[PDB]
Swiss-Prot record, chain B:
The protein's role, per its UniProt record: Constitutively active, non-selective divalent cation-conducting channel that is permeable to Ca(2+), Mn(2+), and Mg(2+), with a high permeability for Ca(2+). However, can be enhanced by increasing temperature and by ligands, including the endogenous neurosteroid pregnenolone sulfate and sphingosine-1 and suppressed by intracellular Mg(2+). Implicated in a variety of cellular processes, including insulin/peptide secretion, vascular constriction and dilation, noxious heat sensing, inflammatory and spontaneous pain sensitivity.
Compartments, record wording: Cell membrane
Family named by the database record: Belongs to the transient receptor (TC 1.A.4) family. LTrpC subfamily. TRPM3 sub-subfamily.
Source organism: Mus musculus
Protein name stated in the entry: Transient receptor potential cation channel subfamily M member 3
Gene: Trpm3
Length: 325, 149
């Protein structure tokens, strides 16, 4: 503790300054690992012993500790809290899969009630986290808690699932709509496992690299979108010239050109052999347009995107390593 | 069952030929590179498994809302989404054209999920895997050459 500097250790001063090169030093990492290990003395092979201890309380006594009171010492380490939370989340995910896979009855099953309890208590904990924030302004605590993206997506998912639950406890059609809302919602909870993955040394950097390659890829999404839209409009306006205006036109533009570049290159679905059906005027340009579009979208743009990912990997790798540390 | 165990054995004995192959100068290093590249690949296999499971659960729970609890459910989650990203993207088996069948509630979301799932699994993760294999090749090659010698 530093008396002159208002009871702040060097680590807190370094963190407040956003000094990445200081925290990422070897000594700071060793100190953080020692603090994370708590009061235990398992170094060579940990984690599995933590799982064995949390599953079997008698296994706690056969551990080496640092200088009755052993159980409270073990259970309050950060690592065992993390593993307890991870096991709880795995159980919640299993129950959320089970409730949506099988048929849903009029009133919720007990597993569904467990899922509702999990969501409600997690919302309560988030509310507690908001309420006990450091700044003294009740409006600035919300804006200082909405600084990450995970705690924003959690709020959105909690609100959406609450809306779906309220819609569920109704008659049959609104119950089906609530089921569809649950089906959409489960995707986010499955994706959220990357936050749990982020503890592992070799997975966090990969997640950060993915997060940056998303914005690296967002442009070659747009260019391929333009090419695909052009081809789709051309094929739709060549093959079918006698269609009344309907919203089905907006589906044929994006459907077939998108499914064509992913292996469903069908010469019978498009370019029909027109006993034999009558041939449309100017319909012999569809194979040529398709050939050019496939050549551009599968040999040029994807290879250029591969090159872009390849040549900017060292910088992103180093930055992600520093940020995770 | 005897011949099935024989099939498992012949799988292993066919794989065992690489130890004989590791005599030639240009084949031992490639095998010892394959081992470390598999060690690298396992992580992206895990991530793709998570994404695949998410899409499979969403599809199964959207399209069929009146199924019974059976072990066939654990197959439909993994089977079709895994075979989809390997060149079988048949848009007829997925999203049936709901004379015409009555549409399921929210049966239009499935192609919207499919677009994002294919975009992630064929344009992002595999390209990042290629980049990982590319930027960590020289040191692996040198170490493999030394260990073979
Ligand atoms: C908003 C939730 C609505 C739920 C209903 C719809 C859900 C379907 C879409 C899923 C959207 C989930 C949002 C998760 C994105 C937040 C990432 C983040 O927090 O950044 C932290 C982190 C950085 O924040 P920093 O502290 O500012 O640096 O960046 C990442 O780690 C990126 C991790 C996400 C990348 C992989 C996941 C993308 C998969 C989406 C593909 C859709 C699958 C469909 C099958
Ligand atoms: C779904 C998982 C999401 C949570 C992810 C959980 C985070 C995660 O993936 O790692 C935790 C644990 C291994 O990590 P853990 O910290 O326990 O132990 C590390 C490991 O022994 C390394 O080999 C050590 O050296 P290095 O690093 O090689 O140099 C390292 O010491 P250090 O030399 O570094 O000081 C040790 O810290 O693995 C499991 O999940 C076991 C349960 C199996 C899974 C059980 C379920 C199948
Ligand atoms: C053919 O007739 C069968 C019948 C017995 C039926 O028993 C059922 C018991 C529930 C059970 C085991 C069954 C089918 C889906 C099973 C789900 C698959 C899910 O997968 C997992 C997959 C991976 C997890 C990550 C997510 O959930 C489970 C939560 C989930 C899971 C294992 C819950 C358990 C379900 C079978 C015969 O007896 C008379
Ligand atoms: C089933 O019967 C339908 C009928 C109502 C029909 O209303 C029509 C109004 C015009 C509208 C919305 C319709 C079909 C093609 C639609 C085009 C698709 C084009 O796509 C876009 C695609 C993307 C844009 C970038 C380019 O253009 C539009 C210029 C274009 C677009 C959105 C213009 C709008 C057109 C439906 C029901 O009423 C009784």
């Amino acid at each position: 503790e530093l008396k002159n500097w208002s009871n702040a250790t060097c680590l807190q001063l370094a963190v407040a300054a956003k000094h990445r090169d200081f925290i990422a030093h070897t000594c700071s990492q060793m100190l953080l690992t020692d603090m994370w290990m708590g009061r235990l003395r398992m170094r060579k092979n940990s984690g599995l012993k933590v799982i064995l201890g949390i599953l079997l309380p008698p296994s706690i006594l056969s551990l080496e500790f640092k200088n009755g009171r052993k159980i409270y010492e073990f259970y309050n380490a950060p690592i065992v809290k993390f593993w307890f939370y991870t096991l709880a989340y795995i159980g919640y995910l299993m129950l959320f899969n089970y409730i949506v896979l099988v048929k849903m009855e009029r009133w919720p099953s007990t597993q569904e009630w467990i899922v509702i309890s999990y969501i409600f208590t997690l919302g309560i904990e988030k509310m507690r986290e908001i309420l006990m924030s450091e700044p003294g302004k009740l409006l600035q605590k919300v804006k200082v808690w909405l600084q990450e993206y995970w705690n924003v997506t959690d709020l959105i998912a909690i609100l959406l699932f609450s809306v779906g639950m309220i819609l569920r406890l109704q008659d049959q059609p609104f119950r089906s709509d609530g089921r569809v809302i649950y089906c959409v919602n489960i995707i986010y909870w499955y994706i959220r496992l990357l936050d749990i993955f982020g503890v592992n040394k070799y997975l966090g950097p990969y997640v950060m690299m993915i997060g940056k390659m998303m914005i690296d890829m967002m442009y070659f999404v747009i260019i391929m979108l333009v090419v695909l839209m052009s081809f789709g409009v051309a094929r739709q306006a060549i093959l079918f010239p006698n269609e009344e205006p309907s919203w089905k036109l907006a589906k044929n533009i994006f459907y077939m050109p998108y499914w064509m570049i992913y292996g469903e290159v069908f010469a019978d679905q498009i370019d029909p052999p027109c006993q034999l059906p009558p041939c449309k005027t100017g319909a012999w340009i569809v194979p040529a347009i398709m050939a050019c579009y496939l050549l551009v979208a599968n040999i040029l743009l994807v290879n250029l995107l591969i090159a872009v990912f390849n040549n900017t990997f060292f910088e992103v790798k180093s930055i992600s390593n520093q940020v995770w540390k």
